[PDB]
Paper text:
Phytochromes (phys), first discovered in plants, are red and far-red photoreceptors that are also widely found in bacteria and fungi later. PhyA is distinct from other phys and is responsible for the very low fluence response (VLFR) under a broad spectrum of light and for the far-red light high irradiance response (FR-HIR). In higher plants, phys share a conserved domain structure consisting of an N-terminal photosensory module (PSM) followed by two tandem Period/ARNT/Singleminded (PAS) domains, and a C-terminal histidine kinase-related domain (HKRD). Then, we solved cryo-electron microscopy (cryo-EM) structures of apo-AtphyA, AtphyA-Pr and ZmphyA1-Pr at resolutions of 3.8 Å, 3.0 Å and 3.3 Å, respectively.
Structural comparison of apo-AtphyA and AtphyA-Pr revealed that they share a highly similar homodimeric structure. However, notable differences were found around the PΦB-binding cradle. Except for those in the GAF helix-α5, the key residues involved in PΦB binding retain similar conformations in apo and Pr states of phyA. Tyr327 of apo-phyA helix-α5 can cause obvious steric clash with the D ring of PΦB. Thus, helix-α5 of AtphyA-Pr moves outwards, to accommodate the bulk of PΦB and facilitate the formation of covalent thioether linkage between them. Similarly, in AtphyA-Pr, the PRSSF motif contacts GAF helix-α5 through hydrophobic interaction with its Phe554. Nonetheless, this contact is probably abolished in apo-AtphyA, as a closer location of GAF helix-α5 might cause substantial steric clashes with the PRSSF motif. Thus, the portion downstream of the WGG motif in the PHY tongue of apo-phyA becomes more disordered than that of phyA-Pr, facilitating the entrance of PΦB to its pocket. Size-exclusion chromatography assays demonstrated that PΦB-free phyA (apo-phyA) and Pr conformer of phyA (phyA-Pr) have a similar molecular weight of ~250 kDa.
Residue numbers in the entry:
A (entry chain A): 75 to 109, 120 to 348, 361 to 535, 556 to 590, 743 to 1041, 1051 to 1119
B (entry chain B): 75 to 110, 120 to 347, 360 to 534, 562 to 590, 743 to 1039, 1052 to 1119
Write the structure that this text describes.
Amino acid sequence: QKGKLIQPFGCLLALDEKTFKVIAYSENASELLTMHPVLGIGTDIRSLFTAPSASALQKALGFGDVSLLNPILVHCRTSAKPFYAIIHRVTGSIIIDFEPVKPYEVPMTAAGALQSYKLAAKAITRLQSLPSGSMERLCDTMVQEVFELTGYDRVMAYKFHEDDHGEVVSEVTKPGLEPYLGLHYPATDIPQAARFLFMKNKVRMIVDCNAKHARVLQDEKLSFDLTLCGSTLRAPHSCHLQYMANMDSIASLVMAVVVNEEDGKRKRLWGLVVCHNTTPRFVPFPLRYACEFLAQVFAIHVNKEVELDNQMVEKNILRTQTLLCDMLMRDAPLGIVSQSPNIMDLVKCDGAALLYKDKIWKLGTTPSEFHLQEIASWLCEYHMDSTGLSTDSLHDAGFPRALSLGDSVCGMAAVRISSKDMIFWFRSHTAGEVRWGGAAFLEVVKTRSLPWKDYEMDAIHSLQLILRNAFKDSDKFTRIEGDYKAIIQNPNPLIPPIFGTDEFGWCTEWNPAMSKLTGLKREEVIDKMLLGEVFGTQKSCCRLKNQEAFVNLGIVLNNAVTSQDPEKVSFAFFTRGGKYVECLLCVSKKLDREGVVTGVFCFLQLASHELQQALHVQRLAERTAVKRLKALAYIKRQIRNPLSGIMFTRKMIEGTELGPEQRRILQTSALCQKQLSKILDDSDLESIIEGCLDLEMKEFTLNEVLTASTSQVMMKSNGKSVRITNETGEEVMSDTLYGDSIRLQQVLADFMLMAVNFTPSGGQLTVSASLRKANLEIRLTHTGAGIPEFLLNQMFGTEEDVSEEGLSLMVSRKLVKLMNGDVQYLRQAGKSSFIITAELAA
Amino acid sequence: QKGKLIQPFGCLLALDEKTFKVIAYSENASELLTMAHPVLGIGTDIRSLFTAPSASALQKALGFGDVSLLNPILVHCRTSAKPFYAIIHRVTGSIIIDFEPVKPYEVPMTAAGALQSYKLAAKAITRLQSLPSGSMERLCDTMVQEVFELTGYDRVMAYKFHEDDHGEVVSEVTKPGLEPYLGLHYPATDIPQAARFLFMKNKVRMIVDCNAKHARVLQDEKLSFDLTLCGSTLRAPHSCHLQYMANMDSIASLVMAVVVNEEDQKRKRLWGLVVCHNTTPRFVPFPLRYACEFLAQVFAIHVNKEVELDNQMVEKNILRTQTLLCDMLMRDAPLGIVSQSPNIMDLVKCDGAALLYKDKIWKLGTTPSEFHLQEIASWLCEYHMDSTGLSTDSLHDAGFPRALSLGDSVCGMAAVRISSKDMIFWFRSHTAGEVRWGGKTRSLPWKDYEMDAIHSLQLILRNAFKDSDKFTRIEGDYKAIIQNPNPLIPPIFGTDEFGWCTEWNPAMSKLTGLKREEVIDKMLLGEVFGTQKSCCRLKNQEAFVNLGIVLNNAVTSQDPEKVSFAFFTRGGKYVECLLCVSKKLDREGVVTGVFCFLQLASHELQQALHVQRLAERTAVKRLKALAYIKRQIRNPLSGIMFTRKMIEGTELGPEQRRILQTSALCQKQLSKILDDSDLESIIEGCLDLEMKEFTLNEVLTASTSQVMMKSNGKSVRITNETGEEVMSDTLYGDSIRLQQVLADFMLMAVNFTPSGGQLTVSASLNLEIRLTHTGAGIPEFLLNQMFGTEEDVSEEGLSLMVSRKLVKLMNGDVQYLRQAGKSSFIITAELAA
């Protein structure tokens, strides 16, 4: 922080807060500024520059927060050399850094901050337009935009893990360089001092490494040593220089990403965005400022997308709760595997087994009954005081016959239902490969399975509890997964609140979870009418807020009596003492064995507010989507009807004898109607955009296509008085082609109709076709300026969304791509040419 | 309320709260319950006239806490069978038990409690719940239709109370052959306030027969207080309802009550009644009455919801007026607003705009003559000295000397003075007003926020001119009710290109608590709006970054955008609103900063737009796919049109010409149906119809050509038997939509028909078209879908619903008639010949 060496592309001056006189100066500063006022201790600052520059600098030092006006434009007194001045406040002193102003780009008058921030107005918009839910897309977009703005050769999205070991997540380099994606790096490349330094100043630049750095002339009479930690000209340290030495890079630009995560707010370094170049380069301060702002935006976005993945766990927990509630109705024996929701959906796995009275059931990939007997015997004999176990890899646990099992089963999770009854879940082997570069060593994770999370064990234990209670009517788990001997622990049940009533309305079920959630003892509440006594506005144990809640509860119960499916509704009630519980009620029928309705069975689902709002938004979106789909189907039918009408009328007209030229005109109309029926037959363009398509195989000739297109277009062409000519040879005509004719006619007609529309009044258009032995090349040459550049760019498929005409162009290009061809646009003096390539069978 | 007379269809008993002995009774009880026994006298026990389980149930009910839960207690008499309901009420110092006979023709023990009783109305509640919001008349008509279907009474009416207690019939449903009173107002004296309070206390009242003889109640003389039968369901009318029934020609009555909770606990007001009248005596079981009482609660909830939605719509409208009141400071000179398209005609709802400025008169829309405007200004400057504005909806009543000569084209005038010579007029048009009572143009009166908007426009224009209070008396039949409208100018702050503050209007000073002098000449980011050492403290980093982003985007982009904003003021109050930004382009065309204003929005409205925007962001491709399809429609249509032209380009015969013209008719049909989607055409004003000459022969031929294909597919023959006299006659009206309607009607007739069936077409001229097809006929549930009874509609039924609504737009109805092997579709409409 006190290294007295600075880079030579700029100069530094350290002054006092009160005297405004130069104390610390650099050797190159005297040369650059005086290129006469001798730069030295006790010299003023105004005389080195002109009067307006001195006034601006003095006002800047007089400001409260100089960081808002950091890039200042100043002029040297002699020859008016432009310079960028940056002000920074060290304890008891002001440090100003001056850099030369190359032509480059200049903001309006003084750059300030907002104008500099304006330089990154496109990358911010592109980042804010991405659909949420995919961190990799965000990383790729940020890296690409940083590459575009900075212009450095290589851009990397180095990421920090919990053990501070790096992992590149993306990279975009110029062609002709070694990719670095996926290469892990050790924790000694970046010392913790570097991270601490980056936590303070977010952007660091090293313009060149093999350059002689000047020194400073810090005053001897100063009572404190100057700190160069905050200055942007501080010379790189040897340890940091070793990084570029091992990375064969010269110019570096490192931008920290700082997120704010709530205390378990505390700051955290999500990673870095590193830029490298093989040759030295320098960029103006506004570009660095804009890059820092863009990094702030990216940090905000990543912090937002972490919270969205924090909700998938809650959603899966709710789904498991629903499954557990559903499974409570089935009979204890064989009811575990009776219907579609078996114990495969309880925890993610590929094999399940239920040992009960020597009747081993199989549900998938699982060892033989012999091997299952052996593993059950081993678990019984070794782990006496273990109701349940979860082994990551059976080899590590110590199963003698784990070798004979093979690679099919690796992880195991077993529970003891009763003295002789047990349940097993098995997981197949997954191998992990980590490049682990910058070290390269290639570590192996041996034969291990995916870890068993907490809520999976919680669900398994809840299932065990349910089965034990059901069997009775008719707790420490050893987790040897980290090869750290026994880490036995106690899980928690995952039973949601439940209450059930008979047909009349008297309470009959009140489980301990509800007793804890409400605070009401079951003995206190049972044998009381559900509507009016347990839940009621006045004179009731649990006080509903309004009369609307009472009406809604009554409606929900009455509707649920009729319908078997469990409707999800909102619920809100006060507890015994002044607490407003807001949950999501689910009611289901209670059909008995014979099939007589006995009552209702209800359970709540406690959920955070964001999840409920997301569910509401999803419901609204699906309703809007179904309405739009119904409207589109209605329109399609109402257009299909007159389509059939005109088909039949054309058939009737063809029934009467007419001229051979009339016959040709009728045939051209027939091709037009077939094209119309085909385009109306398409369900939507989204399937075309996705890529899933089929092209029919049929015989055709070019005369039909050309005549259909000309008949389609020439009315509009003559609207602008446009001449159309055909130069295709008759030999190419006589040749017959094979493929999908309708797509070709529609695509070529659209392209050449756009050419007609772009044709100025009185222009000329020529159509030619060439057959090479087969390949067909189509040239459409129209007189005029042609399509503008932006529309030509919109024609390409790189853009996600374009104009309607641009969308038609993109769809035609995609169809040509599926037609193993290409589309080219050529501009010449007063001419524009479309070239279309196709490959078919002759 | 203390009347000792009861209706004869039930019986009454009274029990002491503690001793549980009978103290009052009725002769109907003597003739109905103990008939074949203990004497029904004072002090007689209760557990002797019923079976032991019945006595146990009665004892348990009496010992219960809240008896009003399990009211319809079915009880078996001591004699064999003879069921009876046992409704119970707790009155001061007694418990009153009413028995009503259970007729076994219906309801064989289908309800024994409140929860089971409420089940009978599940279908009605489901139908009411899923209706789209924003239409009171639809809710009322559905509600009364459901009442009619559930109860089966002859006449059902929704009777809405106004502020002056005088009622208005909003809807009504009756069996055919009955005189309607729809829309007829009634005096407030028909229903006394005592009846209103009684309805507020007892939600449902039933009078089975007005002519039935009432029976007395024998009560002990030893009690110190008389028994009150006000809460009992067995009470006799006190001649107040007898006269009402005689006047309305009714014999039986079932009258409910609608109670709505309105904010100042919130008060409860009787929004109206749902009255059922019958010409013959009728009896409904207690569960049906109990369910009809439950339906009223859902109806009241929905009515309150619709009222809140209307209030939010009003707030959105005033927000829009506030937004459009801006963009007039930017425009230079008074002529600038007149020249531009969003003119002063859009500031307030008017049919004519006039501006008098320096001997120049600028007029827009329906406006009087120049001499008329000059004489209006002369009158206003000659009779009104100190006024800054005038307002009236009837200029004739205003006292204009030549108001009658001005005609009915313009009636209401609102005028505001800008300078000593320049001033502004807003004029309205003719409105139709009819009021009925069961016992020169008037235009809608000017509201208050309209006056506020006009006053703020006056302030803006006078400020701009300088840079270069007023009485309404027509809302009532009075004179010179002076008012002082307040302005509607939103808070405004504006900065230059560097970021320093430049303009900070007083509204922002009031809202945020700061002052103009202490904030001016400071950077907008960091100094004013900042997380630290700032006047207005932002919440966290995200707000700062978002504000910077929106400022930069506003500078770069060209259109205003709305972004949520939230900050702490200097007094600790958390303000949340919407921020709108715009570029402050100079006359030359170079940006010189930004101009921003806040739109303080209500919490419900603000949160009703976040979810809307979030849902909008989900659908992107499908929104523009419709426009893409609409634009790409033209090319195949142009191709088919030009192919038709070339087909015409040679020699043709008579039949060939006819079939070509039929094809062309279908061609225009396809063109105009693909040109516009028309959405649902819910409003009759929308979907303007082309009206041109046509003949019926072409229409019929074009309609049957589209379906001959399917007819020959099933080998179904179609015959047209309309006479040549009707065919030769020419009508002036819409044709092609009639072609489509006829075509899809015969298409549906072909569907669901056996092969070899006969289809017959007839027309009578009022145009009536009858299409009779032989076979089994269309299934009933399809007709239920097409009539709108079933909310869920199939794709095939949607076309029939569209055709029915189109026929209704032609002021007609579609009729389905069923006979042995015959189904007849009758379409009726009118045109000009």
